[PDB]
Design a protein around this ligand. Sequence first.
Ligand SMILES: [Zn+2]
Length: 140
Amino acid sequence: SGAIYVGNYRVVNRHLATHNDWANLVWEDSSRDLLVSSTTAQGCDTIARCDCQTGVYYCSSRRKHYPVSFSKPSLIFVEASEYYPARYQSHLMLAVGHSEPGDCGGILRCQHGVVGIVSTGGNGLVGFADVRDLLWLDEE
Ligand SMILES: [Zn+2]
């Protein structure tokens, strides 16, 4: 589990979104496994605005933050998981590392802020849903 809290936005994995998230929906995209809902309270996370390919992610299933290199956001074929069939997922970045279903929502961060959240895992790879192209999170 996990979210990003920026301004009056909450960013979560679409497959973990709550009723309150859908009841306060701003934007959602199945292909990216992302959903954004509106918040009453201001959040304090900063979204990275950059093309970094190195950062650190949180892996809840190891209680550890791991430094990783990660690929550029792309359309990646993902094997079936407990929460999606095998499919193409867009705006996804891969690293070599551990990721189980419960790790979804863990933050990937670089020097500029939050890059994205864990979304995929298996075959010794971790996949992160990028948020750096969602420039509207910074405003309004
Ligand atoms: Zn960066």
